[PDB]
């Protein structure tokens, strides 16, 4: 399955993301308005991927058009990137189970964790700037890349492209904040600590939201939603937790309802595991 | 030395009242009483912990640990 993400305008970009979501996921019964929902990725066999062709970096122009991302379908991870001009798939070391026919697969030494990518890139995501201009720069870096080990510029390019494709697919919040950079003003998107925290809590969020039944709030670690509009404004696609390993940290209880708020059980457990404070502090 | 940086795969309360965590495939114990709830809270929320110690072989002790969200 192949989809285009077209960066020409905010319209073309959001349309692209919405079409992907519609094809690969199904709305939650209880978090859906119109055709805008939190949706659960439909089950695919392990190893299944879809391709994303990057378009519209130069508005409405058929240039800068040789970059494709390979996305593992069940978890939306970028498995690597394809230079369609050289017919080469540069694949991260944690995706040797992703096989793409027809391309030359270059198996990289670099893994795709944000820890690794930020290190190699010498670029932290908190505060990282993304503009149309730096997406073009990212595209050029990825097209110039060769070899089995990511360089700094290739890693920076992957950080930016993953944010505006896969992470925006997951989070309507990131879609909404980044898309302003596509406008004629050409402003800069700066990814916030809150954006980063969302991405880091995706698995936990995915385990909790299927249990939502209209509670006044949702609390998942550092993440809080106070109403359905906050949920819908923030989250668009979650893992299928029925199942995926990212759904579970420990224990087997997704949620606890406390005072009309749906808590991730592990969050409550993590502040209800303290003994008597006087005994704690004096028992050194 | 930075011995381990990862999620807590298990924790164990030991018979000598120290507390062990397994991080990145190696086991580390601490006698620091303050750390016991903190380490369990880390395990419960999937925090990334950074274990630092003068020796990093499995079975080494530690008193210094960083708690990260990311």
């Amino acid at each position: 399955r192949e989809f285009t993400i077209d960066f020409s305008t905010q319209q073309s970009y959001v349309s692209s993301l919405n079409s992907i979501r519609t094809e690969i996921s199904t709305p939650l019964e209880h978090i859906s308005q119109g055709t805008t929902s939190v949706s659960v990725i439909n089950h695919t066999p392990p190893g299944s991927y879809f391709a994303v062709d990057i378009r519209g970096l130069d508005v409405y122009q058929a240039r800068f058009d040789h970059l494709r991302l390979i996305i593992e379908q069940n978890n939306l991870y970028v498995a690597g990137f394809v230079n369609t001009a050289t017919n080469t798939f540069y694949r991260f070391s944690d995706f040797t189970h992703i096989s793409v026919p027809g391309v030359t697969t270059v198996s990289m030494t670099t893994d795709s964790s944000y820890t690794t990518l930020q290190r190699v890139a010498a670029l932290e995501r908190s505060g990282m700037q993304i503009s149309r201009h730096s997406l073009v720069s990212s595209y050029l870096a990825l097209m110039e890349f060769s070899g089995n080990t990511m360089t700094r510029d290739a890693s920076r390019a992957v950080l930016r492209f993953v944010t505006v494709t896969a992470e925006a697919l997951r989070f309507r919040q990131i879609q909404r904040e980044f898309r302003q950079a596509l406008s004629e003003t050409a402003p800069v998107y700066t990814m916030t600590p809150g954006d980063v925290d969302l991405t880091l809590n995706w698995g936990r969020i995915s385990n909790v939201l299927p249990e939502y039944r209209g509670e006044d709030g949702v609390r998942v670690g550092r993440i809080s939603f106070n109403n359905i509009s906050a949920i819908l404004g923030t989250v668009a696609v979650i893992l299928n937790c029925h199942s995926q390993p990212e759904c579970q940290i420990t224990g087997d209880r997704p949620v606890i309802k406390i005072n009309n708020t749906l808590w991730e059980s592990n969050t409550a457990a993590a502040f209800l595991n303290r003994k008597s404070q006087f005994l704690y502090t004096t028992g050194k | 030395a930075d011995c381990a940086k990862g999620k807590i795969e298990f924790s164990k309360y030991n018979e000598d009242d120290t507390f062990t965590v397994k991080v990145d495939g190696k086991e580390y114990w601490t006698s620091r009483w303050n750390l016991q709830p903190l380490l369990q809270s880390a395990q419960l929320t999937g925090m990334t912990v950074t274990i630092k110690s003068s020796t990093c072989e499995s079975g080494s002790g530690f008193a210094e640990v960083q708690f990260n969200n990311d």
Binding site: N75, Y77, V78, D94, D111, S112, S113, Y114, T115, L117, V158, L159, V162, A166, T199, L200, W202, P245, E246 | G6, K7, T48, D70
Partner: peptide, 5 residues
């Protein structure tokens, strides 16, 4: 496992 991109 730490978050993968």
């Amino acid at each position: 496992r730490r978050r993968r991109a």
